[PDB]
Amino acid sequence: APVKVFGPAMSTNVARVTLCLEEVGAEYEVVNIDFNTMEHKSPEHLARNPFGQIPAFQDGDLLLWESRAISKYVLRKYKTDEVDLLRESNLEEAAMVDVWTEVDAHTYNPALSPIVYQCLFNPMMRGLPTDEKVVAESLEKLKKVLEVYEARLSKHSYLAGDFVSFADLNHFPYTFYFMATPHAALFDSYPHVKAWWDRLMARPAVKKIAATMVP
Amino acid sequence: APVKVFGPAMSTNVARVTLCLEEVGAEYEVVNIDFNTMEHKSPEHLARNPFGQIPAFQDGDLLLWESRAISKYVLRKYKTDEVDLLRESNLEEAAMVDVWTEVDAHTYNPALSPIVYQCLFNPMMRGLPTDEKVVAESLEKLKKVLEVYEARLSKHSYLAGDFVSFADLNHFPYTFYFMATPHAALFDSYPHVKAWWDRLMARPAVKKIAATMVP
Ligand SMILES: N[C@@H](CCC(=O)N[C@@H](CSc1ccc([N+](=O)[O-])c2nonc12)C(=O)NCC(=O)O)C(=O)O
Ligand SMILES: N[C@@H](CCC(=O)N[C@@H](CSc1ccc([N+](=O)[O-])c2nonc12)C(=O)NCC(=O)O)C(=O)O
C-alpha cells in the first residue's frame, strides 16, 4: 500500500522524506497541505502532527512527524542489501552517518538555511524583504563550515566514508534551494564540496525530487 | 578499555553522553576541556572535533562529535536485552524514539534552552545580563510545547511509549538546568509532564549525572 507524505512537494523537509522514498523505490503519495489556508493547523493535520508543522507521514495506522524520524523509518522498513543508507549493519559506519546527519542539523543548515530564507523564501514566497546583515553573517559562517567539508570530502567521496548515505541525502534539499540564490557560485571555491554536490545531483532519485521542487 | 568524553562535566551536551554511558554501565573517563583557555579550539581538540565544540568522544581509534551521534554509538555498542533504549529491534518503537528525539532538538530545546541560557548561563557563567524579552517569548512558546507533552504523557508513561528510551534521556540535561531557574515551578502546571520528570530524576543513572552538573 502507499505510504503517504503530508505537505507541499516544494517543502525542503518534504523533499528529505520523498528523496529517501525514491532512493529505496517505495510506492508513496504526496497529499498537499495548503499553508495559504492554514491546513497545517487544521484539526485533521494536528491528528498527524500535534505541533501543526509539515511534513507528516502515514504508513497504514502509523502517523509520524519530524522529517528525519520519518526518513529513518523509510530507510529501515525498505532496507535491501543493495540500499543500506544507514549502515546499521556496521557500528562505526552507522556512527559516521549519525555524526554528519547531526552536523547538517546543528552546524551546516543553521549557516546555509537563512541565506535560502532571506534571498529566496522571503521575497518569492512571503513578500517580506532580504536582511543583508543576516546574509553577510551566515555567508561568513558558511565559508568556515565549507572549509571543514572541503577537508572531509578530499579524503572520502561522501561525508560518512566512501559510500553515499543518509548523511549526504540530508544536505540535498536546503542546498538545492541555496543553488537557486545569487550565492550558488560560493561552492565553486570548494572544488571537493562541489564535486560531491554534482555526484548527488546526478543520482536518479535526486533528479526526480529536484523536478518536484518548483512552484 | 575506557571510552573517553571530552568536555566539562557540567556541559548539557556532555551530560547527554555521560547519562547514556551510566544507563548502559560502560567504563568511561571525562577529560576536561577548559573554555577559559580556549582548549576547545586547541589543535588537539580540533583533531577530535574539527568544528571546535564539546563534546567529543574517543573509543580506541574512533573519534566522534555531536552528542546525539556519540549517544547512539554508546547505546548500540553496549545494548543488552535489559537495556534497548533505541528499540532498533522494533521498527514502530524505533520510529517513536526518533520522532521525540527530533522534537527535543527542533521544538522543545529551542523553546526551553534560551531560558536556561538567559536566566542561568549568562549571569552565572558569562557575566552578561538576562534578556527579559527573550525570556517572556520562549516561556509562552514553552507553555504551548508542554500542552502537547502533557497530552502525550497522560497516555504513555514515556514519550516513546510505555518504556523509558533515548527520547526521554535527551530531555534530561537542559531540563535539569531549567529546574535551577526561577521558572522551574512552570512544570507544576503540567501534572503528567511533572510526574514523568520525577520518574526520570529517580533513575540511578540520572541521579549520578545530576551530581556531576554543578561547578
Ligand atoms: N524539524 C522539522 C521542521 C518542520 C518545519 O519547519 N516545517 C515548516 C514548513 S514552513 C512553510 C511555510 C510557509 C509556506 N508557504 O507556502 O507560504 C510553505 N510552503 O512550504 N513549506 C512552507 C512548518 O510547517 N512550519 C509551520 C509552523 O511552524 O507554524 C522537520 O524536519 O520536519
Ligand atoms: N549540537 C552539538 C552542540 C555542541 C555545543 O553547542 N557545544 C558548545 C558548549 S558551550 C560552552 C561555552 C562556555 C563555557 N564556559 O565554561 O564559559 C562552557 N562550559 O561548558 N560548556 C560551555 C560549544 O562547544 N561551543 C563552542 C563554540 O561553538 O565555539 C552537540 O549536541 O554536541
Side-chain angles (χ1 to χ4, degrees), chain A residues 102 106-107, chain B residues 8 11-13 16 33-36 38 40-41 51-55 65-68 70 121 125 174:
Chain A
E102 289 312 299
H106 292 279
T107 302
Chain B
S11 161
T12 55
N13 292 281
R16 179 187 291 158
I33 277 141
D34 193 6
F35 279 71
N36 263 107
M38 300 307 291
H40 62 286
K41 309 301 209 202
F51 299 107
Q53 289 200 312
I54 59 98
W65 68 104
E66 287 290 342
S67 58
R68 290 168 184 96
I70 294 176
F121 181 109
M125 222 65 131
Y174 281 97

PDB file of all heavy atoms in Angstrom, chain A residues 102 106-107, chain B residues 8 10-13 16 33-36 38 40-41 51-55 65-68 70 121 125-126 174, ligand 2, unseen atoms left out:
ATOM      1  N   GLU A 102      23.810  14.846  12.240  1.00  0.00           N
ATOM      2  CA  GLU A 102      23.801  15.897  13.296  1.00  0.00           C
ATOM      3  C   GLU A 102      24.487  17.184  12.814  1.00  0.00           C
ATOM      4  O   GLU A 102      24.003  18.274  13.174  1.00  0.00           O
ATOM      5  CB  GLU A 102      24.500  15.416  14.571  1.00  0.00           C
ATOM      6  CG  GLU A 102      23.748  14.363  15.357  1.00  0.00           C
ATOM      7  CD  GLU A 102      22.281  14.596  15.631  1.00  0.00           C
ATOM      8  OE1 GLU A 102      21.941  15.597  16.284  1.00  0.00           O
ATOM      9  OE2 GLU A 102      21.475  13.726  15.255  1.00  0.00           O
ATOM     10  N   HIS A 106      22.919  20.837  12.988  1.00  0.00           N
ATOM     11  CA  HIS A 106      23.364  21.763  14.083  1.00  0.00           C
ATOM     12  C   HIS A 106      24.421  22.776  13.659  1.00  0.00           C
ATOM     13  O   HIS A 106      24.738  23.621  14.501  1.00  0.00           O
ATOM     14  CB  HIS A 106      23.796  21.030  15.340  1.00  0.00           C
ATOM     15  CG  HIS A 106      22.649  20.356  16.006  1.00  0.00           C
ATOM     16  ND1 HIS A 106      21.777  21.041  16.813  1.00  0.00           N
ATOM     17  CD2 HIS A 106      22.190  19.082  15.910  1.00  0.00           C
ATOM     18  CE1 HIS A 106      20.870  20.193  17.243  1.00  0.00           C
ATOM     19  NE2 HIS A 106      21.085  19.008  16.656  1.00  0.00           N
ATOM     20  N   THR A 107      25.088  22.551  12.534  1.00  0.00           N
ATOM     21  CA  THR A 107      26.226  23.338  12.076  1.00  0.00           C
ATOM     22  C   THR A 107      25.956  23.846  10.664  1.00  0.00           C
ATOM     23  O   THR A 107      26.022  25.071  10.505  1.00  0.00           O
ATOM     24  CB  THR A 107      27.525  22.527  12.134  1.00  0.00           C
ATOM     25  OG1 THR A 107      27.633  22.136  13.479  1.00  0.00           O
ATOM     26  CG2 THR A 107      28.743  23.323  11.710  1.00  0.00           C
TER      27      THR A 107
ATOM     28  N   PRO B   8      33.758  19.794  29.780  1.00  0.00           N
ATOM     29  CA  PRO B   8      33.462  19.968  31.197  1.00  0.00           C
ATOM     30  C   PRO B   8      32.190  19.177  31.538  1.00  0.00           C
ATOM     31  O   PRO B   8      31.268  19.055  30.705  1.00  0.00           O
ATOM     32  CB  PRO B   8      33.326  21.476  31.414  1.00  0.00           C
ATOM     33  CG  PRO B   8      33.513  22.072  30.040  1.00  0.00           C
ATOM     34  CD  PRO B   8      33.384  20.966  28.998  1.00  0.00           C
ATOM     35  N   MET B  10      29.775  19.478  33.679  1.00  0.00           N
ATOM     36  CA  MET B  10      28.616  20.410  33.762  1.00  0.00           C
ATOM     37  C   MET B  10      27.918  20.507  32.392  1.00  0.00           C
ATOM     38  O   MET B  10      26.743  20.674  32.365  1.00  0.00           O
ATOM     39  CB  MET B  10      29.099  21.825  34.154  1.00  0.00           C
ATOM     40  N   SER B  11      28.647  20.494  31.283  1.00  0.00           N
ATOM     41  CA  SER B  11      28.081  20.761  29.941  1.00  0.00           C
ATOM     42  C   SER B  11      26.852  19.854  29.710  1.00  0.00           C
ATOM     43  O   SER B  11      26.958  18.607  29.983  1.00  0.00           O
ATOM     44  CB  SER B  11      29.105  20.617  28.841  1.00  0.00           C
ATOM     45  OG  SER B  11      28.472  20.445  27.555  1.00  0.00           O
ATOM     46  N   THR B  12      25.737  20.458  29.280  1.00  0.00           N
ATOM     47  CA  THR B  12      24.464  19.774  28.920  1.00  0.00           C
ATOM     48  C   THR B  12      24.714  18.705  27.854  1.00  0.00           C
ATOM     49  O   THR B  12      24.238  17.575  28.035  1.00  0.00           O
ATOM     50  CB  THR B  12      23.422  20.756  28.400  1.00  0.00           C
ATOM     51  OG1 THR B  12      24.083  21.420  27.330  1.00  0.00           O
ATOM     52  CG2 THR B  12      22.984  21.792  29.409  1.00  0.00           C
ATOM     53  N   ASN B  13      25.492  19.005  26.818  1.00  0.00           N
ATOM     54  CA  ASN B  13      25.752  18.003  25.745  1.00  0.00           C
ATOM     55  C   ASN B  13      26.723  16.917  26.238  1.00  0.00           C
ATOM     56  O   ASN B  13      26.545  15.776  25.826  1.00  0.00           O
ATOM     57  CB  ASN B  13      26.094  18.729  24.459  1.00  0.00           C
ATOM     58  CG  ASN B  13      24.875  19.470  23.918  1.00  0.00           C
ATOM     59  OD1 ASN B  13      23.987  18.883  23.307  1.00  0.00           O
ATOM     60  ND2 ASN B  13      24.840  20.768  24.114  1.00  0.00           N
ATOM     61  N   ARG B  16      24.338  14.552  28.212  1.00  0.00           N
ATOM     62  CA  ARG B  16      23.565  13.623  27.319  1.00  0.00           C
ATOM     63  C   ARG B  16      24.402  12.331  27.151  1.00  0.00           C
ATOM     64  O   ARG B  16      23.909  11.262  27.423  1.00  0.00           O
ATOM     65  CB  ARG B  16      23.237  14.384  26.015  1.00  0.00           C
ATOM     66  CG  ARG B  16      22.472  13.654  24.903  1.00  0.00           C
ATOM     67  CD  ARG B  16      22.480  14.621  23.692  1.00  0.00           C
ATOM     68  NE  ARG B  16      21.614  15.719  24.115  1.00  0.00           N
ATOM     69  CZ  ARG B  16      21.600  16.942  23.650  1.00  0.00           C
ATOM     70  NH1 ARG B  16      22.346  17.281  22.614  1.00  0.00           N
ATOM     71  NH2 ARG B  16      20.853  17.855  24.239  1.00  0.00           N
ATOM     72  N   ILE B  33      37.703  19.883  29.223  1.00  0.00           N
ATOM     73  CA  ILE B  33      38.204  20.917  28.274  1.00  0.00           C
ATOM     74  C   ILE B  33      37.845  22.314  28.794  1.00  0.00           C
ATOM     75  O   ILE B  33      36.645  22.614  29.016  1.00  0.00           O
ATOM     76  CB  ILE B  33      37.731  20.596  26.843  1.00  0.00           C
ATOM     77  CG1 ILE B  33      38.676  19.576  26.205  1.00  0.00           C
ATOM     78  CG2 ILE B  33      37.655  21.825  25.925  1.00  0.00           C
ATOM     79  CD1 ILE B  33      37.912  18.608  25.402  1.00  0.00           C
ATOM     80  N   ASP B  34      38.873  23.145  28.903  1.00  0.00           N
ATOM     81  CA  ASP B  34      38.868  24.452  29.589  1.00  0.00           C
ATOM     82  C   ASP B  34      38.483  25.542  28.566  1.00  0.00           C
ATOM     83  O   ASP B  34      39.340  26.087  27.910  1.00  0.00           O
ATOM     84  CB  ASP B  34      40.209  24.577  30.290  1.00  0.00           C
ATOM     85  CG  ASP B  34      40.323  25.698  31.300  1.00  0.00           C
ATOM     86  OD1 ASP B  34      39.323  26.337  31.564  1.00  0.00           O
ATOM     87  OD2 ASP B  34      41.454  25.937  31.782  1.00  0.00           O
ATOM     88  N   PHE B  35      37.215  25.916  28.496  1.00  0.00           N
ATOM     89  CA  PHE B  35      36.754  27.100  27.732  1.00  0.00           C
ATOM     90  C   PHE B  35      37.526  28.355  28.111  1.00  0.00           C
ATOM     91  O   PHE B  35      37.868  29.112  27.224  1.00  0.00           O
ATOM     92  CB  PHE B  35      35.259  27.271  27.916  1.00  0.00           C
ATOM     93  CG  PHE B  35      34.544  26.345  26.982  1.00  0.00           C
ATOM     94  CD1 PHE B  35      34.550  24.986  27.193  1.00  0.00           C
ATOM     95  CD2 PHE B  35      33.944  26.834  25.838  1.00  0.00           C
ATOM     96  CE1 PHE B  35      33.891  24.125  26.325  1.00  0.00           C
ATOM     97  CE2 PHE B  35      33.325  25.979  24.954  1.00  0.00           C
ATOM     98  CZ  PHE B  35      33.265  24.627  25.212  1.00  0.00           C
ATOM     99  N   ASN B  36      37.875  28.528  29.373  1.00  0.00           N
ATOM    100  CA  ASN B  36      38.591  29.740  29.817  1.00  0.00           C
ATOM    101  C   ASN B  36      39.937  29.878  29.083  1.00  0.00           C
ATOM    102  O   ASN B  36      40.463  31.003  29.057  1.00  0.00           O
ATOM    103  CB  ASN B  36      38.711  29.770  31.350  1.00  0.00           C
ATOM    104  CG  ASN B  36      37.607  30.636  31.917  1.00  0.00           C
ATOM    105  OD1 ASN B  36      36.658  30.125  32.495  1.00  0.00           O
ATOM    106  ND2 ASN B  36      37.686  31.945  31.665  1.00  0.00           N
ATOM    107  N   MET B  38      40.466  28.414  25.937  1.00  0.00           N
ATOM    108  CA  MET B  38      40.151  28.128  24.509  1.00  0.00           C
ATOM    109  C   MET B  38      40.621  26.698  24.111  1.00  0.00           C
ATOM    110  O   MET B  38      40.797  26.472  22.918  1.00  0.00           O
ATOM    111  CB  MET B  38      40.759  29.177  23.562  1.00  0.00           C
ATOM    112  CG  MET B  38      40.306  30.649  23.769  1.00  0.00           C
ATOM    113  SD  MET B  38      38.505  30.748  23.764  1.00  0.00           S
ATOM    114  CE  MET B  38      38.049  30.383  22.066  1.00  0.00           C
ATOM    115  N   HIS B  40      38.980  24.067  23.571  1.00  0.00           N
ATOM    116  CA  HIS B  40      38.024  23.538  22.591  1.00  0.00           C
ATOM    117  C   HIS B  40      38.418  23.952  21.185  1.00  0.00           C
ATOM    118  O   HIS B  40      37.945  23.293  20.276  1.00  0.00           O
ATOM    119  CB  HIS B  40      36.597  23.940  22.951  1.00  0.00           C
ATOM    120  CG  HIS B  40      36.362  25.402  22.945  1.00  0.00           C
ATOM    121  ND1 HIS B  40      36.843  26.217  23.939  1.00  0.00           N
ATOM    122  CD2 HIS B  40      35.650  26.179  22.100  1.00  0.00           C
ATOM    123  CE1 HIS B  40      36.479  27.459  23.689  1.00  0.00           C
ATOM    124  NE2 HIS B  40      35.731  27.463  22.585  1.00  0.00           N
ATOM    125  N   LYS B  41      39.242  24.964  21.030  1.00  0.00           N
ATOM    126  CA  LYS B  41      39.824  25.346  19.736  1.00  0.00           C
ATOM    127  C   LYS B  41      41.277  24.917  19.658  1.00  0.00           C
ATOM    128  O   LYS B  41      41.895  25.245  18.646  1.00  0.00           O
ATOM    129  CB  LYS B  41      39.735  26.878  19.514  1.00  0.00           C
ATOM    130  CG  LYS B  41      38.331  27.400  19.742  1.00  0.00           C
ATOM    131  CD  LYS B  41      37.399  26.739  18.819  1.00  0.00           C
ATOM    132  CE  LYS B  41      36.217  27.616  18.458  1.00  0.00           C
ATOM    133  NZ  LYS B  41      35.093  26.796  17.986  1.00  0.00           N
ATOM    134  N   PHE B  51      35.036  21.190  14.144  1.00  0.00           N
ATOM    135  CA  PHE B  51      34.248  22.424  14.366  1.00  0.00           C
ATOM    136  C   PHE B  51      34.582  23.019  15.734  1.00  0.00           C
ATOM    137  O   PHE B  51      34.320  24.199  15.895  1.00  0.00           O
ATOM    138  CB  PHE B  51      32.776  22.165  14.173  1.00  0.00           C
ATOM    139  CG  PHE B  51      32.407  21.694  12.781  1.00  0.00           C
ATOM    140  CD1 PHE B  51      32.054  20.370  12.583  1.00  0.00           C
ATOM    141  CD2 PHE B  51      32.404  22.554  11.708  1.00  0.00           C
ATOM    142  CE1 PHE B  51      31.693  19.937  11.325  1.00  0.00           C
ATOM    143  CE2 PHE B  51      32.094  22.116  10.446  1.00  0.00           C
ATOM    144  CZ  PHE B  51      31.692  20.815  10.266  1.00  0.00           C
ATOM    145  N   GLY B  52      35.349  22.337  16.588  1.00  0.00           N
ATOM    146  CA  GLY B  52      35.948  23.034  17.747  1.00  0.00           C
ATOM    147  C   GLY B  52      34.905  23.318  18.824  1.00  0.00           C
ATOM    148  O   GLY B  52      34.867  24.432  19.341  1.00  0.00           O
ATOM    149  N   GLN B  53      34.120  22.305  19.147  1.00  0.00           N
ATOM    150  CA  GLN B  53      32.959  22.339  20.078  1.00  0.00           C
ATOM    151  C   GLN B  53      33.080  21.087  20.942  1.00  0.00           C
ATOM    152  O   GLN B  53      33.653  20.082  20.430  1.00  0.00           O
ATOM    153  CB  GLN B  53      31.630  22.317  19.313  1.00  0.00           C
ATOM    154  CG  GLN B  53      31.302  23.618  18.564  1.00  0.00           C
ATOM    155  CD  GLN B  53      29.824  23.695  18.252  1.00  0.00           C
ATOM    156  OE1 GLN B  53      29.262  22.744  17.753  1.00  0.00           O
ATOM    157  NE2 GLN B  53      29.197  24.842  18.498  1.00  0.00           N
ATOM    158  N   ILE B  54      32.595  21.138  22.181  1.00  0.00           N
ATOM    159  CA  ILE B  54      32.404  19.932  23.046  1.00  0.00           C
ATOM    160  C   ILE B  54      30.946  19.505  22.967  1.00  0.00           C
ATOM    161  O   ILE B  54      30.095  20.328  22.636  1.00  0.00           O
ATOM    162  CB  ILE B  54      32.835  20.264  24.485  1.00  0.00           C
ATOM    163  CG1 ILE B  54      32.030  21.433  25.055  1.00  0.00           C
ATOM    164  CG2 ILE B  54      34.342  20.524  24.543  1.00  0.00           C
ATOM    165  CD1 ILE B  54      30.865  21.053  25.943  1.00  0.00           C
ATOM    166  N   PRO B  55      30.617  18.221  23.218  1.00  0.00           N
ATOM    167  CA  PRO B  55      31.617  17.175  23.455  1.00  0.00           C
ATOM    168  C   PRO B  55      32.304  16.536  22.231  1.00  0.00           C
ATOM    169  O   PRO B  55      31.799  16.580  21.127  1.00  0.00           O
ATOM    170  CB  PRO B  55      30.804  16.049  24.077  1.00  0.00           C
ATOM    171  CG  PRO B  55      29.403  16.213  23.476  1.00  0.00           C
ATOM    172  CD  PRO B  55      29.253  17.705  23.259  1.00  0.00           C
ATOM    173  N   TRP B  65      32.086  13.324  17.328  1.00  0.00           N
ATOM    174  CA  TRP B  65      31.446  14.555  17.899  1.00  0.00           C
ATOM    175  C   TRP B  65      29.931  14.571  17.605  1.00  0.00           C
ATOM    176  O   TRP B  65      29.483  13.618  16.925  1.00  0.00           O
ATOM    177  CB  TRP B  65      32.126  15.822  17.373  1.00  0.00           C
ATOM    178  CG  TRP B  65      31.935  16.130  15.917  1.00  0.00           C
ATOM    179  CD1 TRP B  65      31.102  17.082  15.434  1.00  0.00           C
ATOM    180  CD2 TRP B  65      32.628  15.579  14.763  1.00  0.00           C
ATOM    181  NE1 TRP B  65      31.193  17.141  14.071  1.00  0.00           N
ATOM    182  CE2 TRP B  65      32.137  16.260  13.630  1.00  0.00           C
ATOM    183  CE3 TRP B  65      33.638  14.616  14.573  1.00  0.00           C
ATOM    184  CZ2 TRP B  65      32.573  15.994  12.332  1.00  0.00           C
ATOM    185  CZ3 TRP B  65      34.124  14.394  13.300  1.00  0.00           C
ATOM    186  CH2 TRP B  65      33.579  15.050  12.195  1.00  0.00           C
ATOM    187  N   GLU B  66      29.195  15.622  18.041  1.00  0.00           N
ATOM    188  CA  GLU B  66      27.698  15.726  18.084  1.00  0.00           C
ATOM    189  C   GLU B  66      27.138  14.728  19.100  1.00  0.00           C
ATOM    190  O   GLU B  66      27.116  13.455  18.817  1.00  0.00           O
ATOM    191  CB  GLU B  66      27.140  15.564  16.679  1.00  0.00           C
ATOM    192  CG  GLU B  66      27.404  16.790  15.823  1.00  0.00           C
ATOM    193  CD  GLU B  66      26.582  17.997  16.252  1.00  0.00           C
ATOM    194  OE1 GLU B  66      25.582  17.771  16.965  1.00  0.00           O
ATOM    195  OE2 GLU B  66      26.858  19.103  15.806  1.00  0.00           O
ATOM    196  N   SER B  67      26.805  15.238  20.289  1.00  0.00           N
ATOM    197  CA  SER B  67      26.317  14.444  21.452  1.00  0.00           C
ATOM    198  C   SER B  67      25.301  13.386  21.076  1.00  0.00           C
ATOM    199  O   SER B  67      25.204  12.363  21.794  1.00  0.00           O
ATOM    200  CB  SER B  67      25.740  15.345  22.527  1.00  0.00           C
ATOM    201  OG  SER B  67      24.680  16.132  22.017  1.00  0.00           O
ATOM    202  N   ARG B  68      24.519  13.574  20.028  1.00  0.00           N
ATOM    203  CA  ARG B  68      23.431  12.576  19.811  1.00  0.00           C
ATOM    204  C   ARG B  68      23.977  11.367  19.052  1.00  0.00           C
ATOM    205  O   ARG B  68      23.447  10.252  19.275  1.00  0.00           O
ATOM    206  CB  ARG B  68      22.191  13.201  19.174  1.00  0.00           C
ATOM    207  CG  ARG B  68      21.438  14.128  20.121  1.00  0.00           C
ATOM    208  CD  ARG B  68      20.402  14.960  19.398  1.00  0.00           C
ATOM    209  NE  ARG B  68      19.746  15.904  20.275  1.00  0.00           N
ATOM    210  CZ  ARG B  68      20.090  17.200  20.440  1.00  0.00           C
ATOM    211  NH1 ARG B  68      21.193  17.706  19.919  1.00  0.00           N
ATOM    212  NH2 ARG B  68      19.439  17.935  21.306  1.00  0.00           N
ATOM    213  N   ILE B  70      27.205  10.421  19.186  1.00  0.00           N
ATOM    214  CA  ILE B  70      28.009   9.765  20.245  1.00  0.00           C
ATOM    215  C   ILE B  70      27.076   8.829  20.969  1.00  0.00           C
ATOM    216  O   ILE B  70      27.368   7.624  21.070  1.00  0.00           O
ATOM    217  CB  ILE B  70      28.646  10.801  21.182  1.00  0.00           C
ATOM    218  CG1 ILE B  70      29.654  11.625  20.437  1.00  0.00           C
ATOM    219  CG2 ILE B  70      29.308  10.178  22.384  1.00  0.00           C
ATOM    220  CD1 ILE B  70      30.263  12.749  21.292  1.00  0.00           C
ATOM    221  N   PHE B 121      22.986  30.613  32.451  1.00  0.00           N
ATOM    222  CA  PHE B 121      24.331  30.500  31.815  1.00  0.00           C
ATOM    223  C   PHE B 121      24.867  31.903  31.476  1.00  0.00           C
ATOM    224  O   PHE B 121      26.064  32.005  31.318  1.00  0.00           O
ATOM    225  CB  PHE B 121      24.332  29.534  30.616  1.00  0.00           C
ATOM    226  CG  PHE B 121      25.662  29.315  29.911  1.00  0.00           C
ATOM    227  CD1 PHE B 121      26.340  28.098  30.017  1.00  0.00           C
ATOM    228  CD2 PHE B 121      26.235  30.305  29.105  1.00  0.00           C
ATOM    229  CE1 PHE B 121      27.561  27.896  29.379  1.00  0.00           C
ATOM    230  CE2 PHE B 121      27.461  30.102  28.482  1.00  0.00           C
ATOM    231  CZ  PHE B 121      28.117  28.897  28.614  1.00  0.00           C
ATOM    232  N   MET B 125      27.596  32.094  34.381  1.00  0.00           N
ATOM    233  CA  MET B 125      28.810  31.690  33.618  1.00  0.00           C
ATOM    234  C   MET B 125      29.506  32.937  33.064  1.00  0.00           C
ATOM    235  O   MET B 125      30.638  33.214  33.468  1.00  0.00           O
ATOM    236  CB  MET B 125      28.462  30.768  32.447  1.00  0.00           C
ATOM    237  CG  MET B 125      29.403  29.599  32.270  1.00  0.00           C
ATOM    238  SD  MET B 125      29.278  28.497  33.690  1.00  0.00           S
ATOM    239  CE  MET B 125      29.085  26.902  32.886  1.00  0.00           C
ATOM    240  N   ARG B 126      28.841  33.651  32.162  1.00  0.00           N
ATOM    241  CA  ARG B 126      29.461  34.642  31.262  1.00  0.00           C
ATOM    242  C   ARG B 126      29.571  36.011  31.949  1.00  0.00           C
ATOM    243  O   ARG B 126      30.578  36.664  31.706  1.00  0.00           O
ATOM    244  CB  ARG B 126      28.684  34.700  29.969  1.00  0.00           C
ATOM    245  N   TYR B 174      19.243  19.770  29.625  1.00  0.00           N
ATOM    246  CA  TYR B 174      18.775  21.167  29.603  1.00  0.00           C
ATOM    247  C   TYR B 174      17.606  21.352  30.589  1.00  0.00           C
ATOM    248  O   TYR B 174      17.552  22.373  31.285  1.00  0.00           O
ATOM    249  CB  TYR B 174      18.471  21.590  28.171  1.00  0.00           C
ATOM    250  CG  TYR B 174      19.652  21.964  27.293  1.00  0.00           C
ATOM    251  CD1 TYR B 174      20.182  21.019  26.443  1.00  0.00           C
ATOM    252  CD2 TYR B 174      20.130  23.260  27.178  1.00  0.00           C
ATOM    253  CE1 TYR B 174      21.174  21.331  25.535  1.00  0.00           C
ATOM    254  CE2 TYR B 174      21.124  23.609  26.263  1.00  0.00           C
ATOM    255  CZ  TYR B 174      21.640  22.620  25.435  1.00  0.00           C
ATOM    256  OH  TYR B 174      22.608  22.763  24.492  1.00  0.00           O
TER     257      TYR B 174
HETATM  258  N1  LIG C   2      24.938  20.050  18.554  1.00  0.00           N
HETATM  259  C1  LIG C   2      26.136  19.871  19.423  1.00  0.00           C
HETATM  260  C2  LIG C   2      26.246  21.124  20.268  1.00  0.00           C
HETATM  261  C3  LIG C   2      27.651  21.310  20.874  1.00  0.00           C
HETATM  262  C4  LIG C   2      27.729  22.661  21.580  1.00  0.00           C
HETATM  263  O1  LIG C   2      26.915  23.531  21.310  1.00  0.00           O
HETATM  264  N2  LIG C   2      28.763  22.869  22.398  1.00  0.00           N
HETATM  265  C5  LIG C   2      29.168  24.155  22.981  1.00  0.00           C
HETATM  266  C6  LIG C   2      29.342  24.083  24.514  1.00  0.00           C
HETATM  267  S1  LIG C   2      29.379  25.761  25.082  1.00  0.00           S
HETATM  268  C7  LIG C   2      30.187  26.364  26.474  1.00  0.00           C
HETATM  269  C8  LIG C   2      30.675  27.689  26.437  1.00  0.00           C
HETATM  270  C9  LIG C   2      31.321  28.306  27.507  1.00  0.00           C
HETATM  271  C10 LIG C   2      31.540  27.626  28.714  1.00  0.00           C
HETATM  272  N3  LIG C   2      32.206  28.222  29.804  1.00  0.00           N
HETATM  273  O2  LIG C   2      32.830  27.427  30.798  1.00  0.00           O
HETATM  274  O3  LIG C   2      32.245  29.613  29.899  1.00  0.00           O
HETATM  275  C11 LIG C   2      31.066  26.221  28.862  1.00  0.00           C
HETATM  276  N4  LIG C   2      31.116  25.326  29.868  1.00  0.00           N
HETATM  277  O4  LIG C   2      30.505  24.244  29.372  1.00  0.00           O
HETATM  278  N5  LIG C   2      30.035  24.318  28.120  1.00  0.00           N
HETATM  279  C12 LIG C   2      30.363  25.572  27.727  1.00  0.00           C
HETATM  280  C13 LIG C   2      30.500  24.590  22.354  1.00  0.00           C
HETATM  281  O5  LIG C   2      31.474  23.863  22.465  1.00  0.00           O
HETATM  282  N6  LIG C   2      30.602  25.773  21.733  1.00  0.00           N
HETATM  283  C14 LIG C   2      31.850  26.451  21.497  1.00  0.00           C
HETATM  284  C15 LIG C   2      31.848  27.130  20.164  1.00  0.00           C
HETATM  285  O6  LIG C   2      30.868  26.860  19.323  1.00  0.00           O
HETATM  286  O7  LIG C   2      32.765  27.879  19.858  1.00  0.00           O
HETATM  287  C16 LIG C   2      26.096  18.662  20.341  1.00  0.00           C
HETATM  288  O8  LIG C   2      24.943  18.168  20.842  1.00  0.00           O
HETATM  289  O9  LIG C   2      27.154  18.119  20.662  1.00  0.00           O
END
